[PDB]
Amino acid sequence: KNIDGYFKIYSKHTPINLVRGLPQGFSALEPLVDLPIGINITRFQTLH
Amino acid sequence: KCVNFNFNGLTGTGVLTESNKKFLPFQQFGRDIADTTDAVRDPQTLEI
Amino acid sequence: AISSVLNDILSRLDPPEAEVQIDRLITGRLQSLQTYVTQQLIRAAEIRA
Numbered sequence: 001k002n003i004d005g006y007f008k009i010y011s012k013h014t015p016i017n018l019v020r021g022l023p024q025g026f027s028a029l030e031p032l033v034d035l036p037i038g039i040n041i042t043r044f045q046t047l048h
Numbered sequence: 049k050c051v052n053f054n055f056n057g058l059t060g061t062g063v064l065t066e067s068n069k070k071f072l073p074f075q076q077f078g079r080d081i082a083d084t085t086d087a088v089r090d091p092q093t094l095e096i
Numbered sequence: 097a098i099s100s101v102l103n104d105i106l107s108r109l110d111p112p113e114a115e116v117q118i119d120r121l122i123t124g125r126l127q128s129l130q131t132y133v134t135q136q137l138i139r140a141a142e143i144r145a
Binding site: 059060 | 101
């Protein structure tokens with residue numbers, strides 16, 4: 001999410017057992033790195 | 049002792065004391081239920 | 097007003113200019129404190145009864 005020129009990254013990792021869809025559960029997202037860049041990003045793509 | 053303090057842009061007057069309160073690495077400051085300065089972290093060293 | 101923090105306004109604006117923002121903070125807190133005291137006087141009448 002972009003806040004007035006700042007990028008904030010949330011990261012969480014938990015083991016699950018899943019094939020398709022999503023399991024029912026609850027988890028908390030912990031922030032990782034705040035990026036004070038200020039660029040506007042209108043689009044994104046998968047590089048992987 | 050009770051002194052005038054400025055930490056991370058937060059100002060006020062009160063006694064500076066250490067505690068065991070655990071703060072996440074990205075959190076530089078915290079507030080109480082009254083939306084006032086409660087606990088801060090020093091930028092140069094690691095303390096609560 | 098601009099902000100609710102007093103030390104934020106004092107060290108920021110000018111003495112003639114800050115009196116305008118501080119007056120907005122005072123008059124706003126005068127009615128809020130007067131409302132609580134008025135509410136206590138009404139509630140105390142029910143407790144006295």
